[PDB]
Amino acid sequence: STSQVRQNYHQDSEAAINRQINLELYASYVYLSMSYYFDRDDVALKNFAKYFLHQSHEEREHAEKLMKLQNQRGGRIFLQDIQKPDEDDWESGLNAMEAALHLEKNVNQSLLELHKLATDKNDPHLADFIETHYLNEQVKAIKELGDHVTNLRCMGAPESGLAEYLFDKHTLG
Amino acid sequence: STSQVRQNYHQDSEAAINRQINLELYASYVYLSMSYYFDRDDVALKNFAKYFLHQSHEEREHAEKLMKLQNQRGGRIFLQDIQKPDEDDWESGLNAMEAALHLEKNVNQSLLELHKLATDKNDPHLADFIETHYLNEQVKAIKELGDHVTNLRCMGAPESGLAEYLFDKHTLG
Amino acid sequence: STSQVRQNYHQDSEAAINRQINLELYASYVYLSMSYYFDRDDVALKNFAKYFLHQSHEEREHAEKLMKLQNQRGGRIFLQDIQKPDEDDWESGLNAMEAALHLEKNVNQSLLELHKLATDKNDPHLADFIETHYLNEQVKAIKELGDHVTNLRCMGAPESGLAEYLFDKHTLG
Amino acid sequence: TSQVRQNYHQDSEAAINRQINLELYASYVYLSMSYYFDRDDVALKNFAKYFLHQSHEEREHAEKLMKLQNQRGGRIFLQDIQKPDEDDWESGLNAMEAALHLEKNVNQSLLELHKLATDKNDPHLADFIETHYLNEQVKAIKELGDHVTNLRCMGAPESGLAEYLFDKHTLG
Amino acid sequence: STSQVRQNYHQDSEAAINRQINLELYASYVYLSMSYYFDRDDVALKNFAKYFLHQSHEEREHAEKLMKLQNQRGGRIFLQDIQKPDEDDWESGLNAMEAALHLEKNVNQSLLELHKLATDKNDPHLADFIETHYLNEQVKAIKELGDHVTNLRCMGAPESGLAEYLFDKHTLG
Amino acid sequence: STSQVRQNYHQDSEAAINRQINLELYASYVYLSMSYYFDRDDVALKNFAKYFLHQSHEEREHAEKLMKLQNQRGGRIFLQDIQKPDEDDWESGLNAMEAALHLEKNVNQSLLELHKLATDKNDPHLADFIETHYLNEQVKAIKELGDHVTNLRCMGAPESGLAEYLFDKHTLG
Ligand SMILES: [Ca+2]
Ligand SMILES: [Ca+2]
Ligand SMILES: [Ca+2]
Ligand SMILES: [Ca+2]
Ligand SMILES: [Ca+2]
Ligand SMILES: [Ca+2]
Ligand SMILES: [Ca+2]
Ligand SMILES: [Ca+2]
Ligand SMILES: [Ca+2]
Ligand SMILES: [Ca+2]
Ligand SMILES: [Ca+2]
Ligand SMILES: [Ca+2]
Ligand SMILES: [Fe+3]
Ligand SMILES: [Fe+3]
Ligand SMILES: [Fe+3]
Ligand SMILES: [Fe+3]
Ligand SMILES: [Fe+3]
Ligand SMILES: [Fe+3]
Ligand SMILES: [Fe+3]
Ligand SMILES: [Fe+3]
Ligand SMILES: [Fe+3]
Ligand SMILES: [Fe+3]
Ligand SMILES: [Fe+3]
Ligand SMILES: [Fe+3]
Ligand SMILES: [Fe+3]
Ligand SMILES: [Fe+3]
Ligand SMILES: [Fe+3]
C-alpha cells in the first residue's frame, strides 16, 4: 500500500536508508570486535577496549536513528544480516585505529552518496537530516582517528609496545 | 598457542560460548526489529516499541558479558554473522509477545545445554557463571512474557485493538 | 495441559516444591507456638518470645518465596494442612532452642534432598535457587542455634532461672 | 490456674483458641488466593498483592488473639490449620465473592464470641472484641461487597478486560 | 567429637578445608614477602609494594573466611606451619608478577579439587561456598595478573627499568 | 651487599630484627588460633573471639613495621616458617588469657634483649624505635591481660561458665 504519512519520499531513498541501517549496524559490529580484542589477556589495553566499545554503542545509536527516520517518512524497514568483521585478530592499537579510519571513510562515502540521492530526488528534509545528524559527525570521527594514527606512528608504534601502553594511558585514558 | 591464564577451560566450552555470543546478538536483533515495528505510523504503540528496545539493549549487554567471560577464561572470541530475524512484519502486540516468549525459551534451552556441558567437563566456574548471570534471568523473562501473553489474550487481543491500546498504556506504560 | 512457561521442570521437582512449602509453613507455626509460650505470665521471657516470632515470620517469607518459585517455573501450587506443633508447652529457653535446632536440621535435610533431586533431574536453575536462598541460611541458622544452646548450657540452664533471664537480656536483648 | 486470671471463664478461653485457629485459617485462604493470581495463566498482580496483604493482616489478628489469651491468663492450644477449600480460584470476581463469604463467617464467629463474653459478664473481653475486630470486619465486608459490585457491573468474569481494568484502576 | 551443628559434612571435606586454610595463609606470606621486597632501598617500587601488600591482606581474609566456614559446618580447625616463600629475592616486578600468576593458578587448581570433592560427597553447601567466594575471585585475579605480565613484557621489562618505573606509576598507581 | 642507606646498623641488629619479625608473626598466628577457637559452636564466646582476632591483626601490623624498619636501616629481610601454635584446643577464656599473658611476656623479654643489643652496639635510632613502638605497648598489653586474668579468676572462672559468659558480655563487649 502507501503510508498515510508518506510525502515526497522516493522509493530509492527508502531503499538507500535500509542499506545505511545495515551499514551502521555493521560498523557497530566491527567496533565491538575490536573492543574485545583489546580485552584479551595477551593484549590487555583497557582504554583501547573502552574507546572502541563506546564507538560500537554510538554506531548502534545511529542505526536506530536511521530506523526512526525511515518510520518517520513512511517508508518500511527491511533488515538484513549483519556480517561478521573481516578480521578476528586486529594485530595492534595502531592497526585497529587505521582499520577504523578506513571503515569511517567508507561509511562517510556511502552517506555522501545518500545525500546526493536526496538532492537528486528533491528531498530537502532527507538531505537536511543527513547533514545535521551524520556528515559533521563523520568529519569529526575521521579527524580524530587521523589524529590518533598520527600520534601512534610518531610515538613509534607498532614496533614499540611502550608507545601503545603510554598512548592508551595518556590519550585514551 | 595456549593462553597464560587458561585453566580447566575445555575447547568445547570455548566453542559453545562463541555460539552463545552469536545467539545473544541474534536475540538483540530480533528485539530491535520488533521495537521499530511498533514505531510504524500504522501500528503506533510506543510502549510496545520501548519495551522491545529495552529488551534489545539488555540482550546486547548479555552478549558483551559472554565475550568478557570468554576473554577471562583465556579462550578466543570468534564472531559470526548476525542473521536477520525471521519476519519483517510482526502483525500485532500479542504476536510479538508470543514470538518473544518462543525466542526466550529457545535461548534458555541453549543456555541449559551450555550448563550441562560445563558440568560434564567439570567446569564449576563456568557453570556458576551461567547460573548466576543467565538462568534466573531467563526464568524471569519467560514468566513475564507468559504473563503479558495471558493478559493480552484475556483482554481480547488481537481482535480488539482497544485491548492492545489499553495494555500498551496500563501495563507497558 | 502444560504451562506456556514450563521448561526443564520435572513433575518430581514440582511435587517436592509443594512438600517444601508445607514444611516451611509448619516451621513458621512451630516458631509461633514457641514465641507465645515465652509470652506467658509464668514464663515471661520477652526476648525469647521476640526471637521466635522473628523466626516465624522469616519461615513464612521462605514459604511464600517457594510459592513464587513454583509459579515462576510453571508448576501448580497445592497446599495441605499445616499440622500443629508437637508441643504446647516448650518447658524452657534451653529446651526451645534445642527443639529449634532439631527442626532446623530436619528442614536442612529436606532441602538437601531437594537439591539432590534437582541435580539428578539436571535442573541447574532449581539447584541454584536452593543454594542461593536456602542452604547457607540454614547453615547459619543451625550454627546460631548451636551457639545459643552451648551458652545456655554453660550458664547453668535450665535449672538456673538466673541463667535464662541473663541470656534473654544479654544475648537475645 | 494463672496468677493473673480474673473473671475469665473456661468457655471464653476455649472460644478464643477456636478464634485463633479461624484467623490462621483465613490467613491461609488469602495466601492461596494471592498466589493463584500470581500464576502465569492468570497474571493479575494487584489482585495477588491485595490478597497477600489480607493474609498478613489475618496473621496479625491471630497473633493479637494469642496475646489476649496470654494477657487474661488462659492457655494457648493450637490446632491444625486446614487447607483452603479450593486450589483454583477461577477468577477475580469469584475470589472476591469467596472472600466476602469467608469474612461473613468470621464475623459470625466473632459475634458469637461477643455474646459469650457478655453472657459471662466479661466486659474487658467484649470491649476487646468490639475495638479490634467488629468494626474491622464490618469495614472489610463493606469493601469486599463494593469490589464484587464493581466487578459484576463491569462485566466480570466473562469480560477479561473488566478484571484487567479493575486490577489496574481499583487495586493498583 | 561429632558437633551438634554437623550435617552432610564429610571428613574428607573437613581435611581439605584445613589444607586450604594453610594454603591461603602461605599465599598471604608469599605476597607479604614480595611487598617488602619492593620496599627495599635498591628496588623502591612503592606501588608494586602496595599492590602485593593488599594481596597479602586479602589472602589472610580468605584464610579467616575458610576458618569461619570450618566452624560453621561443625568441623575442627587444625593449623600447620606456614612455610616461608620459595625465594627471598624476587628479582623484578615482572618476575614477581609471573610468580604471583603461578601461585594463583596453583591455588585455583586446589580450589577446583576442593569443589570436585564437595560435588563427589554431595555437599551442595560447600560447593556453592567455593563457587561464591573463591572461584570467580581466582579467575579475576589470574586474568589481572596475566594482563599485568603482558603489559610489562610489552613495555620492554625487565631489560627496561623505565618500563617498570612507568608501569608502577601508571597502572599500579 | 652493604646498602647505600646503611649506617651504624650492626649485623647482629639486622639478625635480631629478622628473629623479632618471625616472633611477631608467630604471635599473630597464636592469636588467630585462639580467636577461632572461641568461634566454635561448642564454645561460642564471640567477644573473646573478636578480642583475640584484633590482637592477631595488631601483631601482624607490628611484624610489618619491623620489616619496614629493616628496609629503612638498609638491612635485608629473611623470613622463616611461622610455627603453628603449641595448642589446638585453648580450653577456656581464662586459660587463653593466661597463655596470652605468657606469650606477651616472652615477646617482651625478647624486645628487652633487642634493646640491650641496640644499646650495646651504640645504635640510638634502633633503641629509640624499640622504646617508641614496642616497649610501652607491651607493658600495656601485659597489664591488660593481667587485669583480665584477675577478673576472670575473681568471678569464679573457669569452674563457672556464667562467669566467662558475663565477662565476655560486660568487659570484652
Ligand atoms: Ca558471511
Ligand atoms: Ca573473511
Ligand atoms: Ca582474511
Ligand atoms: Ca541543506
Ligand atoms: Ca541470511
Ligand atoms: Ca525467512
Ligand atoms: Ca517467512
Ligand atoms: Ca553451582
Ligand atoms: Ca467500647
Ligand atoms: Ca463497649
Ligand atoms: Ca551456585
Ligand atoms: Ca626515647
Ligand atoms: Fe556511523
Ligand atoms: Fe561513524
Ligand atoms: Fe539473553
Ligand atoms: Fe533473555
Ligand atoms: Fe525456612
Ligand atoms: Fe530458618
Ligand atoms: Fe481477622
Ligand atoms: Fe477479617
Ligand atoms: Fe482505562
Ligand atoms: Fe585466596
Ligand atoms: Fe587468591
Ligand atoms: Fe587472590
Ligand atoms: Fe607485638
Ligand atoms: Fe605484643
Ligand atoms: Fe601486643
From Swiss-Prot, chains A, B, C, E, F:
Where, in this chain's numbering, is Fe cation 2 bound?
A: 59, 104, 138
Q: Which UniProt keywords apply?
A: Acetylation, Cytoplasm, Cytoplasmic vesicle, Iron, Iron storage, Lysosome, Metal-binding, Neurodegeneration, Oxidoreductase, Phosphoprotein
**Compartment(s) of residence:** Cytoplasm; Lysosome; Cytoplasmic vesicle, Autophagosome
Q: What chemistry does it catalyse, as a reaction equation?
A: 4 Fe(2+) + O2 + 4 H(+) = 4 Fe(3+) + 2 H2O
GO process annotations (BP): immune response; intracellular iron ion homeostasis; iron ion transport; negative regulation of cell population proliferation; negative regulation of ferroptosis; negative regulation of fibroblast proliferation
* Highest taxon of the lineage: Eukaryota
Q: Pfam families, per this entry?
A: Ferritin
Q: Where is the site Essential for association with cargo receptor NCOA4?
A: 19
Q: What's a Gene Ontology MF term here?
A: iron ion binding
Outcome recorded upon mutating residue 19 to A: Abrogates interaction with NCOA4. Fails to localize to punctate lysosomal structures
The protein's matches in InterPro entries, at most eight in alphabetical order, are given as:
Ferritin, Ferritin-like, Ferritin-like_diiron, Ferritin-like_SF, Ferritin_CS, Ferritin_DPS_dom
> Where does tissue-level expression of this protein occur?
Expressed in the liver.
* Top-level class of the enzyme under EC nomenclature: oxidoreductase
Query: What's one GO-annotated cellular component?
Result: ficolin-1-rich granule lumen
Query: CDD domains, per this entry?
Result: Euk_Ferritin
Question: Which EC number(s) does UniProt give?
Answer: 1.16.3.1
Residue ranges annotated for the Ferritin-like diiron domain, each copy included = 7-156
Q: To which protein family does this belong?
A: Belongs to the ferritin family.
Quaternary organization: Oligomer of 24 subunits. There are two types of subunits: L (light) chain and H (heavy) chain. The major chain can be light or heavy, depending on the species and tissue type. In the human liver, the heavy chain is predominant. The functional molecule forms a roughly spherical shell with a diameter of 12 nm and contains a central cavity into which the insoluble mineral iron core is deposited. Interacts with NCOA4; NCOA4 promotes targeting of the iron-binding ferritin complex to autolysosomes following starvation or iron depletion.
Q: Which PANTHER family match?
A: FERRITIN, FERRITIN HEAVY CHAIN
Record's function text: Stores iron in a soluble, non-toxic, readily available form. Important for iron homeostasis. Has ferroxidase activity. Iron is taken up in the ferrous form and deposited as ferric hydroxides after oxidation. Also plays a role in delivery of iron to cells. Mediates iron uptake in capsule cells of the developing kidney. Delivery to lysosomes is mediated by the cargo receptor NCOA4 for autophagic degradation and release of iron.
What is this protein's record name? Ferritin heavy chain
Q: Which gene encodes it?
A: FTH1
